[PDB]
Amino acid sequence: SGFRKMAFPSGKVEGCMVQVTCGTTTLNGLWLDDVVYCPRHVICTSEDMLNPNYEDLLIRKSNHNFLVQAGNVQLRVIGHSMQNCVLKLKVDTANPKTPKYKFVRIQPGQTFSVLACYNGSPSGVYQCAMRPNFTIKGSFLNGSCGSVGFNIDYDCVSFCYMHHMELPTGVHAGTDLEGNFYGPFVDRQTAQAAGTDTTITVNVLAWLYAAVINGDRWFLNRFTTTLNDFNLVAMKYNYEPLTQDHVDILGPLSAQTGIAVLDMCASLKELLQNGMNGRTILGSALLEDEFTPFDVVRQCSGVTFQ
Amino acid sequence: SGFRKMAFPSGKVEGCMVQVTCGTTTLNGLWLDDVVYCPRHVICTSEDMLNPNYEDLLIRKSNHNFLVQAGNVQLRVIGHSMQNCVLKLKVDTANPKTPKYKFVRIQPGQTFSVLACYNGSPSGVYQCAMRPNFTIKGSFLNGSCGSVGFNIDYDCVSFCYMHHMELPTGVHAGTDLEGNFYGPFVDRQTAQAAGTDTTITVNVLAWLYAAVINGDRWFLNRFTTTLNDFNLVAMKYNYEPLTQDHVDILGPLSAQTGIAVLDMCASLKELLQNGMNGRTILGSALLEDEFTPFDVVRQCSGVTF
Ligand SMILES: CN(C)c1ccc(N(Cc2cc(Cl)cs2)C(=O)Cc2cncc3ccccc23)cc1
Ligand SMILES: CN(C)c1ccc(N(Cc2cc(Cl)cs2)C(=O)Cc2cncc3ccccc23)cc1
C-alpha cells in the first residue's frame, strides 16, 4: 500500500539527452537515431526573441553553427530543418541507446514524467499533468529548454512534451515533439498569460478510488447521481465536464473497489458542496487531480517496464 | 521557477536490478560487480516468517536453490553469505552496468529516491524521507522487497535503503545495504508498530526558503524567536526539535534569501498557529517536510548528474 506521485524510470530517456549550442544559447536536445530535436529558439539571442523571424534566422545558420555534445562526444551536424517550433539536427552518429519510441500528442488531463536537464545532463524526474489551460506546473530554470516529458508502455517511450517557456505566473509551456505548442502560446518574448485553469474531474475521481484502495473511505456516502446532475454541480466549482468516456475509463477502478462510478461522483459532489470538514484524503487537504485512472491502476497493481 | 518533489534519474540503478527466487519466494536484488544483495527473507516461506532462524534456514541451501535472473540471462550463484538482514549472492558474472557506488546509512529527515521494482523490473521512481520514527511513507506492493533507495552525487550512487516490510499502518521498513534495519524493526512476522511520527522541522524550514526563492513571501511576519522558544512552541505541534546544527545547515538558504533562520522559525510558528487560511505554499495546503536543505539548493540551482 501507499500512494505517491511516481515517475517512470528515466534510464531509457537519460540515454537520449544531449547539449545543443548555437552562438551564446545552450539548451537540451533529444537524440533519437541520427536526429537531435530541440526548441527552434536555440537559434535566437534574447534580442531576437522579442521578434524572431525563424525562417530568416535559420537561413543564416550553417551545420557548423550547431555544436551538439553527447556527454564528452562531439556529434557533427550534417543537416538541419525546422518542423513547427522544433529544430531537427541531422548528426553523423545514430544514438546506439535509442529506445523503442513514438511521438504522441497528449490531451489535457494526461500525465507524463519530465526529465529536467541542464547542459544535456539530467537534474531529476517528476510527474506533471497537462492542465486544461495547456500549461504544466513544472520545476524549470533557465537552460532547461529541450527537457522532455514522456510515458512508457512496456518497452516503448512515448515522448509527449518538450520544454520551451516559463509564463509570468511561474507555470510552463512547451510543444509536442513535432513542435506543435500545447495551448495558445508562441515562441516570441511577448505578453502571454496562462488562461483560467479548471480541475481535471476524471483524475480527482481516479484519486478518490486510489484513496479507497488505500483504506480511506470516510467520504463515501449512500447517495447516487446522474452524470448530468453531477456535471451541473461540478461546473459551478470550475471542474471539467465528466464524459461517458471518462466513466468508461474509470470502469476498472470501479470494478476493483465495488464502487459504481456515479456513486463516486455522488461522493465528490458532497465533497465540493461541504469541503473536507478538516479531514484529509491520502494525506492531502486538497482534491488532487494530477493522477490519471491509468496512473492509479499502474501504481496500485505494480505494472513494470522491460 | 517552480518546485516539485523530484527523484534522482534512475538509469544507473535500473541497470543493477535483478529477480531473485528461492523456492516459492521471488523478490528483487541489487547486482553490483559479482554480488547480488537481497533481503535474507527470500529464504523464508510465509510459515517461516513468525520466528525464522536465518542461520539454520540458510545452511540448508545450496547455491542452485537461488535463481537470479538479469532480464533473460540466468546468473549462476557460486556462493552466499548473510550480513545482518541481507543475503549476498556471489555470481559468476560482474554486472557490466555497475555504477560508481557507496553504501551509506542515512539519518532520520534525510531524503532518497526509491526505484519500486517487481520481478527485477522497475515500476517507477519517487522521493521518500527517512521519517523520525525510522519508517518511510512509500508505495510498495507485495513483491517490492529488495527495491532500493539511493542518492546520487554526480556519477556516484549512494545506496541507503533496501525494502523489507510493510507495517500495519501502511508505512514501510527496511535496512541499509549492510542489512541493519532502520529503527527497532526485525524481519519477523511479529506485532511491530510504527512509533508516533513527528514533523521534520529543518525540512519544513528548507521548503519555506524554497517558497521564498520561488517568489512567495505571504507567510513571513515581523517577528523573530529564540531557538528555545521556537522548540517550546513547535514541540506542541509534534515537530522535531531544531538544533544549532539544523540552523547551521540552513545558513546558505538564509544568506540567499536575506531571511535569518530564526526569522523563518517565527514564520513557521505563526503558520502552525494560523494555518494557511485558504492559501497554498508551492501548491500544498499542508507544511511539507520531505525536502532537505540540500534538496532545495540542488533543485533551485539546477545541479545535474
Ligand atoms: C535566449 N533564449 C533562446 C531564450 C529562450 C527562451 C526564453 N524564455 C522566454 C520565452 C520562451 C518562449 Cl518559447 C517565448 S518567450 C523562457 O521562458 C526560457 C525559460 C524556460 N523555462 C524556465 C525558465 C526560467 C527562467 C527564465 C527562463 C526560462 C528566454 C530566452
Ligand atoms: C513470503 N515472504 C518472504 C514474505 C516476506 C515479507 C513479507 N512481509 C511481512 C514482513 C516482512 C518482514 Cl521483514 C517481517 S514481516 C511484507 O511486509 C512484504 C511487503 C512489503 N511491502 C509491501 C507489502 C504490501 C503488502 C503485503 C506485503 C508487503 C511477507 C512475506
From Swiss-Prot, chain A:
Annotated ranges, domain Peptidase C30: 1-306
Result, substituting residue 132 to H: In strain: Omicron/BA.1, Omicron/BA.2, Omicron/BA.2.12.1, Omicron/BA.2.75, Omicron/BA.4, Omicron/BA.5, Omicron/BQ.1.1, Omicron/XBB.1.5, Omicron/EG.5.1
Record function comment: Cleaves the C-terminus of replicase polyprotein at 11 sites. Recognizes substrates containing the core sequence [ILMVF]-Q-|-[SGACN]. Cleaves and inactivates human TRMT1, preventing tRNA guanine(26)-dimethylation of tRNAs. May cleave human NLRP1 in lung epithelial cells, thereby activating the NLRP1 inflammasome pathway. May cleave human GSDMD, triggering alternative GSDME-mediated epithelial cell death upon activation of the NLRP1 inflammasome, which may enhance the release interleukins 1B, 6, 16 and 18. Also able to bind an ADP-ribose-1''-phosphate (ADRP).
Consequence of changing residue 142 to A: Does not affect ability to cleave and inactivate human TRMT1
Subcellular location as annotated: Host cytoplasm; Host Golgi apparatus; Host nucleus
Activity regulation (UniProt): Inhibited by pyridone-containing alpha-ketoamides compounds 13a and 13b. In turn, alpha-ketoamide 13b (tert-butyl (1-((S)-1-(((S)-4-(benzylamino)-3,4-dioxo-1-((S)-2-oxopyrrolidin-3-yl)butan-2-yl)amino)-3-cyclopropyl-1-oxopropan-2-yl)-2-oxo-1,2-dihydropyridin-3-yl)carbamate) inhibits SARS-CoV-2 replication in human lung cells. Inhibited ex vivo by michael acceptor inhibitor N3. Inhibited ex vivo by compound 11a and 11b.
Cytoplasmic side: 1-306
Complex formation: 3CL-PRO exists as monomer and homodimer. Only the homodimer shows catalytic activity. Interacts with host FBXO22; this interaction promotes the proteasomal degradation of nsp5.
Protein name in UniProt: 3C-like proteinase nsp5
Gene that encodes the chain: rep
Cross-link (Glycyl lysine isopeptide (Lys-Gly) (interchain with G-Cter in ubiquitin)): 5, 90
Catalytic activity line of the entry: TSAVLQ-|-SGFRK-NH2 and SGVTFQ-|-GKFKK the two peptides corresponding to the two self-cleavage sites of the SARS 3C-like proteinase are the two most reactive peptide substrates. The enzyme exhibits a strong preference for substrates containing Gln at P1 position and Leu at P2 position
Residue numbers annotated as active site: 41, 145
Effect annotated for changing residue 205 to V: In strain: Zeta/P.2
Originating organism: Severe acute respiratory syndrome coronavirus 2 (2019-nCoV)
Known outcome of mutating residue 145 to A: Complete loss of 3C-like proteinase nsp5 cleavage
